[PDB]
Symmetry: C4
Subunit: 163 residues, 4 copies
Amino acid sequence: MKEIKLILTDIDGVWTDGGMFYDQTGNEWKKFNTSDSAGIFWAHNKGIPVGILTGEKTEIVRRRAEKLKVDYLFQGVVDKLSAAEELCNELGINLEQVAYIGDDLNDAKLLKRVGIAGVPASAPFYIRRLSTIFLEKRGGEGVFREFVEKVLGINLEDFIAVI
Amino acid sequence: MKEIKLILTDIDGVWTDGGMFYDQTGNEWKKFNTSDSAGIFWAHNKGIPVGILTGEKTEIVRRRAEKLKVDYLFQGVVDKLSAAEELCNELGINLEQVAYIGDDLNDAKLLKRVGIAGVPASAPFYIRRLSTIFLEKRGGEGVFREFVEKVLGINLEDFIAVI
Amino acid sequence: MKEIKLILTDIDGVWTDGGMFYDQTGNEWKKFNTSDSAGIFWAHNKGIPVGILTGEKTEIVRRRAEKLKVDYLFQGVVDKLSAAEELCNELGINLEQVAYIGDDLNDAKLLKRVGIAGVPASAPFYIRRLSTIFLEKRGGEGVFREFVEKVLGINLEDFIAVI
Amino acid sequence: KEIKLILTDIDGVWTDGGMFYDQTGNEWKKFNTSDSAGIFWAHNKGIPVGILTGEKTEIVRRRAEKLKVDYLFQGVVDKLSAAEELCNELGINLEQVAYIGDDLNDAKLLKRVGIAGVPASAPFYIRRLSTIFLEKRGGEGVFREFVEKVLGINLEDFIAVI
Ligand SMILES: O=C(O)[C@]1(O)C[C@H](O)[C@@H](O)[C@H]([C@H](O)[C@H](O)CO)O1
Ligand SMILES: O=C(O)[C@]1(O)C[C@H](O)[C@@H](O)[C@H]([C@H](O)[C@H](O)CO)O1
Ligand SMILES: [Mg+2]
Ligand SMILES: [Mg+2]
Ligand SMILES: [Mg+2]
Ligand SMILES: [Mg+2]
């Protein structure tokens, strides 16, 4: 598995199943999966930062990012590739050393430029085929955790060590 | 695929899995799927208006339609066939030039009259046999996206063009 | 199918997948499936009343029974067999003309005494084996509708006649 | 195997790991009524049930109360420690505890109890620690599955309680 210095992740359709709950009062919900917090745990255990790119902008994601101690949160992003290219510049790494997981049209250009691209099994076929690794899980099922554990080559030895 | 000039759609059981969330206070929820927003994207990409016809009337659907910039919204509809005729009559459009997706008893008369009828895989057998194209997805799983993409013949080159 | 004069149904695990959403403030949610309203439609189309029996007692179910025009709503029920018995006395019918659907321990006694017992596929095996008809669907998937349509022999003819 | 105490994780056991956030700082969990049958059988056989969770919410406190769970420990940092405390207090060994958990912070405890349960949904390196097979995933009534297996609940038990 190639060398990774940064893990970037989309939210809707990755950390969730794409679900957007609306009530009558203008409030909104997302459903996260606690399993994906272990994706953060593994990244941080390995000294690798995690950044969230999303084109939505919600208090929902702000609070979830905070809860998970995510290193970067970029909301209302319209150009995901530009966002990553710039974060890479500030870190002095290149796209070949980023792992990005996304599921939709707005992710495609970034998925095509990164060192390892991941797309959940639930995503449209034309995005899915941009994946450079196989992911079994659908969004909301812990696919971000699956992506991280693959990208970082997390194995049983690592598991024994942390416990 | 025949020429389509208007895409119409039901909400519950199509944009959702039929889920209706009630609380203790009289509030109400629906769970939408961000994937279906690509249905609108593609429609608008090909210059095709989208309309929602629903028998329910909620602030939920009003706000959702607004967020997705849906072109026509009709709520509290008792006669979906009449509502589609009236909209179509305004636009100069024939029911044969309409693609409509619905999932239950109240959608049947319209489904039998449109140029392309779609029904999610989750729908009662009586309704699903009215579908004139095959849809794999269930309500809430992005079946509206699926419907639009097939109706408009969205292919890999369309995908390559928009990114 | 035998002659049925009353359809009775549990809520949790039948009309829902057994899910109970709790927030931080003491509020509560259930998720109903709009599909199950067709169960009430078909029952009423055949001149058969529907009654809810549940051990829970919530505003949630109160609203749902109202929205669906359910004929009878009994909540906080500690003994479902008795509750069904007095309602049967009150209506001048007996248990053999009742169709009941339930999914758990508190339903067991009533299920053994009704003319047609239904249990969702999702239920424990010891309850499931009391079903007197096969139900394919799980609670929350529209299994109440499946039950009513099977109990009343709803066929394509019936569908064609009501659209 | 002879059991004196059933302990259980929450998220990913009593739920599918789902955490709902709204825009206002509120939070939800989805429980399954099926799992209350877990408490029912436990109490029926005179076995107490305790909840160990690393989270801390009103959500769980209210669910535990509603289900009349015997023990509740939230914001737990070290689940092994929490369980030993309870075992010492009860005058029992971990060998007489059946525990079900689903993730890293359950591993230590899972490897020490007499019967360890892990939902089908759990990551594989946790799942392999299970000492009995559980078919069900978190949130599908897997706590009930566990109790029923651990206590050997059979049809005769069902006939008796009905
Ligand atoms: O389940 C509901 O809340 C209900 O209002 C009940 C009503 O009996 C039924 O006709 C409608 C219809 O299924 C929806 O309006 C379609 O959107 O649904
Ligand atoms: O999960 C619940 O909150 C609970 O109240 C717990 C209770 O111990 C159980 O017996 C009931 C019963 O399963 C429901 O009432 C079914 O409607 O459910
Ligand atoms: Mg996305
Ligand atoms: Mg519908
Ligand atoms: Mg029930
Ligand atoms: Mg857990």
